[PDB]
Amino acid sequence: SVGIVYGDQYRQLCCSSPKFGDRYALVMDLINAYKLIPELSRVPPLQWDSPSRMYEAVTAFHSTEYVDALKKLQMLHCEELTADDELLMDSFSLNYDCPGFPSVFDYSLAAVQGSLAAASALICRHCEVVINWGGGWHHAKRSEASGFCYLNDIVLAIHRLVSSTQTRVLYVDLDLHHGDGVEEAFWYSPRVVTFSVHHASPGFFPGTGTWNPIFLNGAGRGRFSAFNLPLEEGINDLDWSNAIGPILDSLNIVIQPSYVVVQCGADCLATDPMRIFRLTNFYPLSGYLYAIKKILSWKVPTLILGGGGYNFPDTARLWTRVTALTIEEVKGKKMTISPEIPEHSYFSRYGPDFELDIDYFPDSIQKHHRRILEQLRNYADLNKLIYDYDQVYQLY
Ligand SMILES: COc1ccc(Cn2ccc3ccc(C(=O)NO)cc32)cc1
Numbered sequence: 385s386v387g388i389v390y391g392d393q394y395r396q397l398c399c400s401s402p403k404f405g406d407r408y409a410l411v412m413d414l415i416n417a418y419k420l421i422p423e424l425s426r427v428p429p430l431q432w433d434s435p436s437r438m439y440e441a442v443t444a445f446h447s448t449e450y451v452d453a454l455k456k457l458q459m460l461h462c463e464e465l466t467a468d469d470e471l472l473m474d475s476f477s478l479n480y481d482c483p484g485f486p487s488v489f490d491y492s493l494a495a496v497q498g499s500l501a502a503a504s505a506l507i508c509r510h511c512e513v514v515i516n517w518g519g520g521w522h523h524a525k526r527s528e529a530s531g532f533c534y535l536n537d538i539v540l541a542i543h544r545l546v547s548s549t550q551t552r553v554l555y556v557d558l559d560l561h562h563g564d565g566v567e568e569a570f571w572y573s574p575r576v577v578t579f580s581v582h583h584a585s586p587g588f589f590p591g592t593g594t595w596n597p598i599f600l601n602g603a604g605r606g607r608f609s610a611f612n613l614p615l616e617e618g619i620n621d622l623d624w625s626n627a628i629g630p631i632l633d634s635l636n637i638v639i640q641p642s643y644v645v646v647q648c649g650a651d652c653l654a655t656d657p658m659r660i661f662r663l664t665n666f667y668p669l670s671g672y673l674y675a676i677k678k679i680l681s682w683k684v685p686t687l688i689l690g691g692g693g694y695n696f697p698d699t700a701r702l703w704t705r706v707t708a709l710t711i712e713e714v715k716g717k718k719m720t721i722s723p724e725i726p727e728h729s730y731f732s733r734y735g736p737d738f739e740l741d742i743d744y745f746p747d748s749i750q751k752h753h754r755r756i757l758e759q760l761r762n763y764a765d766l767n768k769l770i771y772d773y774d775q776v777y778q779l780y
């Protein structure tokens with residue numbers, strides 16, 4: 385089936401942060417408003433038998449002293465920090481854009497519980513695809529919070545997938561921001577190929593995913609397994625689609641992944657307050673919906689995850705269509721969405737036009753395309769992989 389992560393306590397935890405507020409709730413209420421929930425298998429967040437089992441699960445990637453620090457920060461916010469406690473938090477970047485707040489640990493752990501359960505649903509073949517709009521926190525590092533990401537649920541999910549059995553995972557990152565934390569976690573791993581398309585420019589967060597000059601792309605046995613495509617501001621649906629479509633198709637052909645994990649951050653939308661990219665949610669074509677439909681036609685068990693997205697109703701408008709599209713492509717069952725927002729709890733946030741379409745008026749890539757094709761051949765040479773060379777060459 386097509387699965388989706390939610391639950392009554394999960395919704396409360398996803399809506400408890402001061403930066404993302406009730407975003408998760410507009411998303412899931414618009415999905416519900418459009419009668420998509422009965423088509424979907426509810427996947428319940430994972431829970432643990434003990435503190436030890438939780439720590440063992442989280443420290444599959446994060447360090448215990450980081451997890452300890454993050455737990456102490458929540459406790460400290462449920463009661464000012466001492467100077468020693470501020471040094472301690474500062475050594476984990478638990479400050480500035482990743483501050484504490486009374487449920488910071490329960491909030492962060494929630495996305496991990498969600499995305500681990502989603503991986504398990506794919507592994508036991510209960511679901512062909514599972515959606516977790518509560519997840520996607522791709523900037524968190526082993527011992528460092530970053531970009532309002534405290535725990536890296538994607539790393540943890542991918543780790544669970546590669547240890548389910550040669551298993552290969554293809555990770556595709558559509559967020560406006562470079563997926564540095566996931567890329568770093570698998571830098572030396574050939575079995576997890578990572579691919580991020582993003583904006584990169586001087587001073588723009590997080591700063592990686594671009595020239596260094598040359599692209600770094602892996603190390604040790606993981607050489608050539610980290611892929612990156614940085615694009616200039618202003619790019620629209622068609623050019624971003626043409627930019628990534630042949631790369632996606634060539635990655636599937638050569639890598640033949642056992643799973644695809646997609647980060648689908650909505651901050652590339654033309655109407656995001658960031659205002660870097662000009663993508664839409666249009667479905668006559670949205671860059672996002674083009675990519676997901678492409679990935680889904682491979683018929684590989686797939687995890688779709690959230691991410692950034694700071695225009696809350698327009699993130700809901702996008703992820704609702706992603707949700708409807710996944711159902712159409714997986715079950716083969718037409719999904720008819722009215723162009724007008726249905727009446728529901730958050731109906732007033734979709735003003736003043738109350739439509740589903742967002743309210744927007746719609747050489748370098750060929751160098752990167754040749755750059756990536758050589759890297760892909762190097763990867764395949766390094767890992768003794770089979771494929772037809774000019775079958776992938778012709779995709780461009
Ligand atoms: C509406 O105003 C805004 C408030 C916050 C931001 C986003 N922002 C600031 C630092 C930073 C780092 C990472 C990300 C992200 O989306 N990763 O996926 C966002 C960040 C924008 C506008």
Ligand SMILES: [K+]
Pocket residue numbers: 557558559560561562563580581582
């Ligand atoms: K990205």
Ligand SMILES: [K+]
Pocket residue numbers: 570571572573574575576577578602606609610
């Ligand atoms: K890798």
Ligand SMILES: [Zn+2]
Pocket residue numbers: 559560561649651691692693
């Ligand atoms: Zn982002």
